[PDB]
Amino acid sequence: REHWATRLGLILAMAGNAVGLGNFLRFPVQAAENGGGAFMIPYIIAFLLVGIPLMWIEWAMGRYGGAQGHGTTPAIFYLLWRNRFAKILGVFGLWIPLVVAIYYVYIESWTLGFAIKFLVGLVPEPPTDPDSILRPFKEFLYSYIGVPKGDEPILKPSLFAYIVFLITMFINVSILIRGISKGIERFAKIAMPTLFILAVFLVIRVFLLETPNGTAADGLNFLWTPDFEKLKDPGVWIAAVGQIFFTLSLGFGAIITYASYVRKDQDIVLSGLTAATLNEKAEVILGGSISIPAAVAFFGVANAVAIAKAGAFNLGFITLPAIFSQTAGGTFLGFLWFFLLFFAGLTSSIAIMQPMIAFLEDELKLSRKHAVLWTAAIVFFSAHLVMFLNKSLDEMDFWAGTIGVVFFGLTELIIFFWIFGADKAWEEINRGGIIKVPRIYYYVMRYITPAFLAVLLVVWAREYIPKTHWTVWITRFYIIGLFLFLTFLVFLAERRRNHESA
Ligand SMILES: CC(C)C[C@H](N)C(=O)O
Ligand code: NA
Ligand code: NA
Structure with missing residues (x-):
């Protein structure tokens, strides 16, 4: 079995896994919609009581399974808990990353395309009407992804966008086809530092932004100013x-x-x-120091929160480039922005396709080449639904990237620390550790976290899930299909094993 060649390569591959669109796109909007500092507090808490312990847990299950030659949840869940239902549940560890991968890679392709257009210098030139700076860039995005002008919820992506999606796919493939140490690690070691540099540069340049409506400092204040009346709100x-x-x-x-x-x-x-x-x-x-500070700088706090409430793409692909077009070399600044987003995205997408590739390799004994190629075929194909069908991306994102991840976090936590046992789990997590997990985190994992996530999920299913256009089903249907598909594969897998054992 393959292994990470170096320590640093491992670290940068993991950070490269985590750091991505969620950082510069999802987060700014999440904090903006939820009131800035008000959102931060729970955030921090959630990071301490959930993020860290679950990170450790996932590392532990990963290494544990890998030792025996299994890198995916369908198998690992089974090893930890021996049941057929452990496999059936483990399927989510494929379905989720695949479904998310479908639209994620697409958005990534967007960032690439925009990077190219901002690099070549083909960008909307705004003619002091606040919207008039935005309108051209809105039309730019809509023209790129082909927002549904008609009654019908149909998207008409540009040829260029599509080609850039093909190219993006090919990049992902070229990175993943070289393996873990050569393909992913070597790339992480470059993309990570590059990313960091770009990010810092942009943060500075943005901190230099000021208009009659405010300064980046205002955005920083809004973001970091605590609100203790919003914590009683379950939504936050x-x-x-x-x-x-x-x-x-x-x-x-x-x-x-x-x-x-x-x-x-x-x-x-x-x-x-x-x-x-x-x-x-x-x-x-x-x-948090780029999008929000810039938007708040130009349009002020209120309009910033409005724009964020509107959408993540509003801030990322419209507001920010529009704000840059008002500055010297703002076009090149836009190019830096979208290039950054592109690298982050890439480093994440390779990571979300790797699970499927790893299932194909480990369980079905496929060569790395074939595993990769087929995973890419499936993703590329399924992507068409996200491409031509409006709100499909939203559906996939909510069911997979939102609910599915929380539910699955709870599931894996229960399987590892409860069914598999708490002491054995702890011992497994701490084994080989340069440092040991603080004793408190035992209880955090065994009691606090599962309760937190259970209650959270319940409230979520009651008050929220109820809070759509029929086409959503077209998506749901399809994704459900994927699940079955994966299940079938799992089935096939467990059959091969038998024939191999006999
Ligand atoms: C679903 C994950 C690949 C998301 C990634 N960790 C990000 O924040 O961009
Ligand atoms: Na992240
Ligand atoms: Na990444």
Whole structure:
């Protein structure tokens, strides 16, 4: 079985896994919608009571399974808990990362395309009407992804966007086809530092932004100014936890698959903690210091929160480039922005496809080449639904990247620390650790977290899920199909094993 060649490569591959679109896109909007500082508090708490412990847990399950040659949840869940239902539940560790991968890779392709257009210097030139700076860029995005002008909820992507999607796919493939150490690690070692540099540069340049409506400092204040009256609101907590999961790549079965290539004796404690910490540094310090500060600078707090409430793509692909077009070399600034987003995205997508590739390799004994190619075929094909059908992406994102990850986090936590046993789980997590997990975190894992997530999920299913266009079903149907498909594969897998044992 393959293993991470180096320590640093492992760390940067993990951080590369976690740090991505969720940082510079999802987060700014999550904090903006939820009131800035008000959103932060629960966030922080969620990071302490959920993100860290679950990170450790996933590292542990990953390494544990990998030692025996299994990097995916369908098998690992079975090893930890011997049941058919353990496999059936483990399927989610494929379905989730695949479904999310479908639209994720697409958005990534968007960032690539925009990077190219901002690089070549083909960008909308705004003619002081506040919307008039935005309108051209809105038309730009809509023209790129082909928003549904008609009654029908149909999208008409540009040829260029489609080609850029093909190219993006090919990039992902070229990276994943070289393996864990050569393909993913080597790339992480470059993309990560590059990303960091770009991010810092952009944060500075943004901190230099000022208009009659405010300064980046205003945005920073809004973001970091605590509100203690918003904590009684369940929604803010649900958003905070969801954001934690998404940004830390927890519940996607990706962290597990990566951890499965960690040598049995290597440290999963200091490493995992380091990945988490890096991701959070990129999350709050970098991602939060660009979009929000800029928007608040130009349009002020109120309009900033309005724009964020509107959409994540509003802030990322419209507001920010529009704000840059008002500055010298703002076009090149836009190019830096979208290039950054592109690298982050890539480093994440490879990570979400790796689980499927790893199932094909481990369980069905497919060569790396074939595994990769087929995974890419499935993703590329399924992507068409997200492409031509409006709100399909939203559906996939909510069911897989939002609910699915929380539910699956709870599931894996219950399987590892409850059914598999708490003491054995703890011992497994701490084994080989350069440092040991603080004693308190035992209880946090065994009691606090599962309760927190259970209650959270209940409230979520009651008050929220009820809060759509029929086409959504077209998506749901399809994704449900995928699940069955995966199940079937699992089935086939468990059959091969038998014939192999006989
Ligand atoms: C679903 C995950 C791949 C998301 C990734 N950790 C990000 O924040 O961009
Ligand atoms: Na992240
Ligand atoms: Na990434």
